[PDB]
Design a protein around this ligand. Structure first.
Ligand SMILES: O=c1[nH]c(S)nc2sccc12
Length: 162
């Protein structure tokens, strides 16, 4: 069902996250981590303290799809295990590392979100946006609800972190 998912998304904030390569999304899916440039790191840390859930929605550039979505479980932190991101740019330019819990590891093609517009990006289609673009609550909730259910994930433990 979708009830626990709707509960996790209640009053959430949503951010579009863009990667030039699939390998970085695969690393994030395997390790439960994400890292971004300082400008976005500051926005996400502010958001994490402001809302019950902060949701990252991932898209690999030129793939025509979103690759899933995850909830921040921590602010960014430095000094952990190195992550061998594939960068376009040195690794020192990245901020710290956020821990994330995946909510959905399934893909969604952009063709399926063509009816969703993001007020925070001039009401352009939600697929359109820079890395770090915030997605308004209603649009972000509907986008997440369009993804295929991911039956491998149990949201019970996620709910307990809220
Ligand atoms: O594609 C990217 N660009 C930047 S600036 N940082 C990262 S961290 C993982 C992927 C990725």
């Amino acid at each position: 069902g979708t009830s626990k998912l709707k509960y996790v998304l209640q009053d959430a904030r949503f951010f579009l996250i863009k990667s030039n390569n699939h390998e970085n999304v695969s690393l994030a899916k395997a390790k439960g981590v994400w890292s971004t440039l300082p400008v976005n790191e500051k926005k996400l840390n502010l958001a994490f303290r402001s809302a019950r859930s902060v949701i990252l929605i991932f898209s690999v550039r030129e793939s025509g799809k979103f690759q899933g979505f995850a909830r921040l479980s921590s602010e960014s932190h430095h000094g952990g295990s190195p992550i061998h991101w594939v960068l376009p740019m040195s690794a020192k330019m990245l901020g710290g590392v956020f821990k994330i819990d995946w909510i959905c590891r399934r893909e969604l093609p952009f063709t399926k979100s063509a009816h969703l517009t993001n007020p925070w990006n001039e009401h352009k289609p939600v697929k359109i946006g820079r890395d770090g673009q915030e997605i308004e609550l209603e649009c972000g909730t509907q986008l997440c609800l369009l993804f295929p259910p991911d039956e491998s994930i149990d949201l019970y433990q996620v709910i307990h972190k809220m």
